[PDB]
Amino acid sequence: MQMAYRFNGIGVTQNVLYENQKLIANQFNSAIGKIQDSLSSTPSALGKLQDVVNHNAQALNTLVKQLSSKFGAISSVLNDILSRLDPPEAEVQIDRLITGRLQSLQTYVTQQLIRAAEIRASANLAATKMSECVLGQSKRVDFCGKGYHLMSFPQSAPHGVVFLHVTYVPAQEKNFTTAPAICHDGKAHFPREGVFVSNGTHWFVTQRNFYEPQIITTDNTFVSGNCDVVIGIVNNTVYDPLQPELDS
């Protein structure tokens, strides 16, 4: 029933769900099954988290390497700069080492601050995606997966979150002849929801997202104007449900 809620949300009537409940359940189950196989693939789609981990490790290792660097001094060793040189020259050598290593620390902290800003941007995006994809149904286009968003599921991952976006994708299009409106008695009828289509001889009114034709009546259409101003209006007959019941 909440799947019917969500189908109504994306613009499809809920009888489409109720009449295809087992087909939709099977499609969802097959897609969920294929997700696990897709993740366990050679591209290793878990690239962002691995890149974050590798960047952190590389920064730490570079900071470690910067210790064993003379920075223009006699040597990078702690005691060997004092057990050999005199206190006066050892003073400037220690100054050289201190400036170099504190510069390394400052550079590392600056890079970490920039990377933390980037990670905070990503985390804010993930938070809004959790709020709008998971805690609700999003009408934003391509925000929550590709297609008409139906729902979403979160999955924790090391230093990240994985969203499984369930979306509704149209599959088998058919071409029809359409019309902005139709005429019955010098009146112009526009569809309340859906569009007017023709299979070649008859005219029906469907919903815009799924081909479910219905007979054009005074319940699916509303009248506004006449057959004078609408460019492309087509003659037809508009069934009145009141006539058979009143005559009988």
Partner: protein, 244 residues
């Protein structure tokens, strides 16, 4: 040095441009103007498939004209060892300036102009409309980093180990050893806040009913698995196994 059409005033010797680099010189012996061009240089990229595929590579001298070094000339430089086909596929290895490279077939390395996608023409008409008759339910994936590793640094210990003759002079570099610590502490607190914002979004802790029948939909792949020591779903378990 090359012949130049510049018009130095009779008293002018050097020649310069923006950033003050010598661009031309007047020759002392014979009165001539020679333009100066820096000797060619540039990075050397190696276009390679995986070593699990082949040990054969192509070499891109980027920016370098194909005269200071099969030999193809792209706007990204000169390519050596890759044959330029006239076809167009999706980009496998991006070289640049619209040129990509791949390992295809004579199984060798080819270079081409990358294709943007399959060409499609929509049957537009005054009164024709396409309406779907069926549908599919598609589950896609988005991976999003949320936090990094929180790291603290002991500046006094890092700069040198057991040494007081360090700290005596280092004290004169005032506040540099605490500003970095403050910044790192802020970063760590921010990481914790990132995780809190992303995940701590429910006041209650909800539980699925013991009967996991949801109208035919099967959530066993995403629901917690009690069998594992950690109550992680099979997908979550796979994610933790993969990223190590």
């Amino acid at each position: 040095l090359t012949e130049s059409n510049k018009k130095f005033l009779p008293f002018q010797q050097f020649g310069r441009d923006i950033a003050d680099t010598t661009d031309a010189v007047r020759d002392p012996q014979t009165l001539e103007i020679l333009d100066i061009t820096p000797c060619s240089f540039g990075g050397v990229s190696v276009i390679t498939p995986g070593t699990n595929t082949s040990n054969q590579v192509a070499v891109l001298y980027q920016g370098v004209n194909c005269t200071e070094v099969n030999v193809f000339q792209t706007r990204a430089g000169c390519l050596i060892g890759a044959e330029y086909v006239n076809n167009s596929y999706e980009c496998d290895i991006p070289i640049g300036a619209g040129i990509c490279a791949s390992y295809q077939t004579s199984q060798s390395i080819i270079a081409y102009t990358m294709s943007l996608g399959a060409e499609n023409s929509v049957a537009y008409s005054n009164n024709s409309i396409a309406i779907p008759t069926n549908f599919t339910i598609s589950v896609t994936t988005e991976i999003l980093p949320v936090s990094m590793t929180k790291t603290s640094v002991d500046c006094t210990m890092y700069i040198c180990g057991d040494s007081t003759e360090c700290s005596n002079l280092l004290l004169q570099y005032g506040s540099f050893c605490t500003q970095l610590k403050r910044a790192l502490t802020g970063i760590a607190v921010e990481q914790d806040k990132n995780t809190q914002e992303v995940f701590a979004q429910v006041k209650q802790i909800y539980k699925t009913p013991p009967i996991k029948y949801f109208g035919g939909f099967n959530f066993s792949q995403i629901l917690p698995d009690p069998s594992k020591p950690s109550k992680r779903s099979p997908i979550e378990d796979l994610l933790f196994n993969k990223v190590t």
